[PDB]
Amino acid sequence: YGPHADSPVLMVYGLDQSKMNCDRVFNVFCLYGNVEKVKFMKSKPGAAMVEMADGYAVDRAITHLNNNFMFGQKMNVCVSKQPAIMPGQSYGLEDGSCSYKDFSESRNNRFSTPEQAAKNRIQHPSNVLHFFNAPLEVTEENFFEICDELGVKRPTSVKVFSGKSERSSSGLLEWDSKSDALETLGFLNHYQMKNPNGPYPYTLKLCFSTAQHAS
RNA sequence: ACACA
RNA sequence: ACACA
Helix, strand or coil: CCCCCCCCEEEEECCCCCCCCHHHHHHHHHCCCCEEEEEEECCCCCEEEEEECHHHHHHHHHHHCCCEEECCEEEEEEECCCCCCCCCCCCCCCCCCCCEEECCCCCCCCCCCHHHHCCCCCCCCCCEEEEEEECCCCCHHHHHHHHHHCCCCCCCEEEEECCCCCCCEEEEEECCCHHHHHHHHHHHCCCECCCCCCCCCCECEEEECCCCCCC
């Protein structure tokens, strides 16, 4: 139905600031479709390359975030000319252990299953944000002290509810700008939850909201 | 802005 | 403890 990119690979630039990393960049556009792998490059003062399902994931990433503002800087996006990303040697990152990472086996892929694709929803970016896999008492109190500990600006509005699951909470958030919700997406997605007596943490997840409000 | 793959 | 109030 929809159009597709000219390559299974994608290119991004403007990653000069220390706030960018392969985990943060790749999950931001991962909410837009199925992904494969990501790779950083030393050949520029701040750039990287990505491999994804090119139809829906590289089209929508180029439709919604490519050269949008983030962290007080820009994250340029456009199509690659490479045939595919190759693993091998690396040099590490300022916020990562390797210049390379893999997601082809990750559950983070939102379109990887028919039980997700039947209820999935996608829209243009906004200052509104949605979350799932969050504590029952996560509200403005846990959202405020978590963002302030990471040095990130806290949201301007918060909402939390139930009935979506009995295992974990869900709700909406909002910021004073679209780039403010996007930079907080980079720092809070896949973040580990705390537990009062649990044997291990479980990760929180978030993405651009389609809700009608955040309060 | 297209790799110590 | 994987996706829209």
